[PDB]
Amino acid sequence: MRKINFSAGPSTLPLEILEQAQKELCDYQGRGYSIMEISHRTKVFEEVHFGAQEKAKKLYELNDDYEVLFLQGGASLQFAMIPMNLALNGVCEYANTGVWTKKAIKEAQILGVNVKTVASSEESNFDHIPRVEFSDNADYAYICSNNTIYGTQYQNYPKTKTPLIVDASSDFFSRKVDFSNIALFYGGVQKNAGISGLSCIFIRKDMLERSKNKQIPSMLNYLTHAENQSLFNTPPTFAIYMFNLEMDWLLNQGGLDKVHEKNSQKATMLYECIDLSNGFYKGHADKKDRSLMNVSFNIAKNKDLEPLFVKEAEEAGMIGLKGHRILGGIRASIYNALNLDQVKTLCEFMKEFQGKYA
């Protein structure tokens, strides 16, 4: 009797991946030990480690210009590694689209990077992606692809000669992406690619050249992890094992275009539920910028109905719906592992709740 789980992160996992991990938790593939229980420096772990790097690259159709790194510390460590590694004497340009770019900006500033916020939707309470124009000569250009709290998402990434850096945590592996100008593309794994404690970084070879000329701690150095293929120290073996099952699961589904079609179907139906509610529900996001991953909305007339909505949802087996504190209201996260039928259950519940409380 598993709950339908709309948590924004950590988030629900495909049941078949959970089932596989359960059935072999004490005895991986009959080898007589848990995947959790051996050295990373074994043929067996390597198979998983290097198979995951390759499948990630296949899903995104990445070429040999990129390395796939598996690091610890979630996306937040990246806010610091990114500037530490890829910064030079130049300007580092950032587009401010939510809580997570504010944080990233603060960390670079802490590191004493010359930071320029070239655009921002903060005034409007981050309810849209502003027009972003990067300069062509910056050290790098930084965006957050999908703003988890506000429920906004870039439709197209900005075009620039400047190396583009993308925090794709909450839309990771959700759709095909144009890497033409992308120098680094990364995500906390725990939204759309597994479990927490693992981050997956796609880094372009020219960026690694930048790490090489930097004198920073090994653990914080991209080049160090590259040369050691993300086994400089112990990686999160279990997490990588889960990522790898996730990769297979994404492959067995038809790849990122298939995943993206299912996601669009789910989002369309949920946003239609909002728009056809005769104004009883209202979304935070500008329609042009509506995220496919995180749907943030309010009960427009009566905020006091929101904690009631959440509790009745729970009583009806749907969890994780409370909006983030910074914003309030409701947030339905409908990541890859959530299916169209579960979103329909939420939609029927929303109609019923309105019929009851309008």
Added chain:
Amino acid sequence: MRKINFSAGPSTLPLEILEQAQKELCDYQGRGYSIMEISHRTKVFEEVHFGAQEKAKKLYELNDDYEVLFLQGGASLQFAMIPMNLALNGVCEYANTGVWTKKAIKEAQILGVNVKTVASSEESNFDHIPRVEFSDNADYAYICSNNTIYGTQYQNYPKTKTPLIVDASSDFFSRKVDFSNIALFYGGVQKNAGISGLSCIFIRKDMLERSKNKQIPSMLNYLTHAENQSLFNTPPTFAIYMFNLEMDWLLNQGGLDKVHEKNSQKATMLYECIDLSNGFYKGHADKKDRSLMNVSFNIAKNKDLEPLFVKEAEEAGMIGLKGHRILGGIRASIYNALNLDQVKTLCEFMKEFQGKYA
């Protein structure tokens, strides 16, 4: 058919913890979701998270002079965070006893810390703990409690007025410890405390004061984590729940004295097997400094017999015995989760192997 697993890290886990985790992997406490699948800021994760902190403190009989922090990045990240937070304009004293101390030394130097190596075992290939004299006015004094590769272990920690930093990764929760002048006590958790991807830091309050005046990235700042109760970002929730099951397991055994006495029994039996072998097996470590955790030895009169030893041990159901490349030979890790019967099984193998090949 579970193997007897002597891996040095990640290491074997108490089968009863694995069986619990397996059992409730899809449905934690019958609540309708996996422990891996919900938010860190629910009352359900918080109970596990904060319970683990308290019990860790209980096992070491620590008071409120210490905070327990749960961080990502293994011990290796600590090689950097330690001098980034705790270093001052003074000199930072290190005792060199193994590969992990050499690494820690290098990382502090990379950060331009004034490092003094006050003692070193390197000349004799780290086969003993040298005599360690720390000055009384340094910023901190750093030691590695148990040197995993060489099989040496401090019997008593150096006494000094300088704040003592201890890397206890490979003997964590193995024995009681005198914290009289310990300012920070830490470990990568996957030797005795669960799974990789989690580190447990015990940090004395006066140390956090030093962090308070540092201008460093939030993720790398001890005070940031203390202030946010190790929930500044998404902690590795699975790892932390595993740790908590470990903590309950240690408590159910009678605490650290009982654990240590079981470990002395096991190590005493292995070392006897080596010592009574009429020279056939020989240990790397000087006897006074023999580790209770990692027993590193060679086949004295025939190196070429070692890979045979490993393979035969394997077919006899025992894994993880290959020594580290740096030393070769054989290495039996006998962490808490290994029992004396398993150490008896290896001794009988050792006797049979000798009979065959001597």
